Amino acid sequence: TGREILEKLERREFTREVLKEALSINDRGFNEALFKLADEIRRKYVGDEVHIRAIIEFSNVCRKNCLYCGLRRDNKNLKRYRMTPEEIVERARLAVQFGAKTIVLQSGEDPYXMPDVISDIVKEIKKMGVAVTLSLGEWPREYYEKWKEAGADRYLLRHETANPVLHRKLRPDTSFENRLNCLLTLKELGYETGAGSMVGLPGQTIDDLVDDLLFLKEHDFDMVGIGPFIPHPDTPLANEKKGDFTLTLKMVALTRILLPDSNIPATTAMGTIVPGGREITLRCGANVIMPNWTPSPYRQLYQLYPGKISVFEKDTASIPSVMKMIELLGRKPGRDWGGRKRVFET
């Protein structure tokens, strides 16, 4: 019964069978109660502040060929771009002027920058007195070490799927073992480390989603980014089904229940598949939002998936828009860098 599963989640009996049953029950009453539980856990543990991370997608060049991603190297039907270091630093400064207290630098796996141009950019942004998060993919230990010495605070490296077989099929340049090794290296180097997965990948099962949740709980990640798979027409997965919004929202809710003190974004992908999806997600366990701060004319070229929101407006609209969102949700903007604030428990 749904009531017994909720009771077990409330008492922290996080077994495989409790998680499977939570993800398998489709009853509206149960789902609503689950979302209420996650919302309440979020409020009790991380409060009403919603942390704003301004994202600059500074290059859409990529050396990898992931089957799901519109930036894959085999996609010839995409104009490739690279922002200059000066452009990236000055765009970061504009975000800080607008009130961002974290800058996220995200790109394809673009060799050009690596490692020294990134280090130089990071040092300049750090002078502005904000947190810096990198989301650049898989690189050698030495690059991660350089970037930590340069001052980077956090690294986002979604694990994508914790099924090694599926991982290798979808990401044929690499492996789950490599992805995990990168995540473990990032943790050892002292980064606040983010992981997370897509929901609704072709071939992915409910038991695979359970394994994503257990993986996340095992490693105690500081941040967890979850969204639906969204098929991209210039990829091998073009004709596959999009991930289900409700199922993905349940994964976000369970992540908060499992990791009550973690930082969990309401991802752009959630707002792409359903109008108002980020707002829903902020009320079902999430406590972070990542407004797009990539300048025109580049923003519209960072086409990981189609239909991405925030492209038709002026490039400075997103930070004000999320501040309005936070207010209409009855929430508060973050007052500090929004680093993880651990609550040690039993």
Ligand X SMILES: C[C@@]1(C(=O)O)N[C@H](C(=O)O)C[Se]1
Ligand Y SMILES: C[S@@+](CC[C@H](N)C(=O)[O-])C[C@H]1O[C@@H](n2cnc3c(N)ncnc32)[C@H](O)[C@@H]1O
The count of residues interacting with ligand Y (CB under 6 A) is 19
Please count the residues of this chain forming the interface with ligand X, following the rule CB under 6 A: 9
Instruction: For 30, list phi and psi in degrees, rounded to 5.
Output: -60, -50
106 touches 86 (CB < 8 A)? no
**Please, which residue, 18 or 104, has the CB nearer to ligand X?**
104
Q: Any contact of residue 167 with ligand Y (CB under 6 A)?
A: no
Q: Least distance (Å) from ligand CPS to the CB of residue 166?
A: 26
In the complex, least distance from residue 237 CB atom to ligand SF4, rounded to whole angstroms: 12
Strands 131-135 and 102-107: parallel
Alpha-carbon distance 9 to 166, whole Å?
28
Helix (H) or strand (E) holding 3: helix 2-10
Distance of CA 172 to the CA centre of its chain: 22
Least Cβ distance, residue 106 to ligand Y (angstroms):
5
Name the nearest CA neighbour of 150 among 130, 129, 128, 132: 132
- Measured between alpha carbons, how far apart are the two ends of the chain, in Å? 27
| Residue 34 and residue 22 in contact, taking contact as beta carbons nearer than 8 Å | yes
Q: Which does 62 bind (CB under 5 to 8 A by kind): ligand SF4, ligand CPS, ligand X, none?
A: ligand SF4
Smallest gap from residue 244 Cβ to ligand SF4 (A) = 21
Beta carbon of residue 271, minimum distance to ligand CPS (angstroms, whole number): 11
Say whether residue 225 binds ligand X (CB under 6 A). Answer: yes
Q: Kindly state whether residue 83 participates in binding ligand Y, applying the rule CB under 6 A.
A: no
Tokens of 119: 């280090």
Is 195 a binding residue for ligand X by CB under 6 A? The answer is no
CA dist 123 and 105 (Å) reads 13
C-alpha distance from residue 75 to each of 64, 81, 146, 223 (Å):
11, 14, 31, 30
Q: Kindly tell me which residue out of 31, 133, 197, 310 binds Cl ion, with binding defined by CB under 5 A.
A: 133
Please identify, using beta-carbon distances, which residue of 119 and 310 lies nearer to ligand X: 310
Query: Which residues contribute to the site for ligand CPS (CB under 6 A)?
Result: 28, 31-32, 35-36, 39, 97-99, 245-246, 249, 274, 280, 283-284, 320, 323-324, 327, 333
Helices and strands in the chain: count of H runs, count of E runs: 13, 10
Are 320 and 54 in contact by the 8 Å Cβ rule? The answer is no
Contacted by 133, from ligand SF4, Cl ion, ligand CPS, none: CB < 5 to 8 Å by type: Cl ion
Instruction: Give the x-and-dash track for 132-171 against ligand SF4 (CB under 6 A).
Output: -----x----------------------------------
* 69 touches, from Cl ion, ligand SF4, ligand X, none (C-beta below 5 to 8 Å by class): ligand SF4
3-state secondary structure of 54: strand
Residue in the block written with tokens 């929004």? 338
- Residue 229 sits in the site that holds ligand Y (CB under 6 A): yes
Binder of ligand SF4 out of 53, 72, 232, 278 (CB under 6 A): 72
Please, what is the minimum distance in Å from the beta carbon of residue 288 to ligand X? 8
Give the nearer residue to ligand CPS in terms of CB position, either 76 or 335.
335
Length of the chain in residues, anyone? 346
Q: How many CA atoms lie within 13 A of 33 on its CB side?
A: 17
For ligand SF4, which residue of 37, 108, 237, 270 counts as binding (CB under 6 A)? 108
Residue 73 is inside which H or E element, if any?
A: none
Q: Which residues bind ligand Y (CB under 6 A)?
A: 68-69, 71, 106, 108-109, 135, 137, 157-158, 160, 198, 227, 229-230, 232, 269, 304-305
Binding site for ligand X (CB under 6 A): 55, 156, 225, 227, 265, 267-269, 290
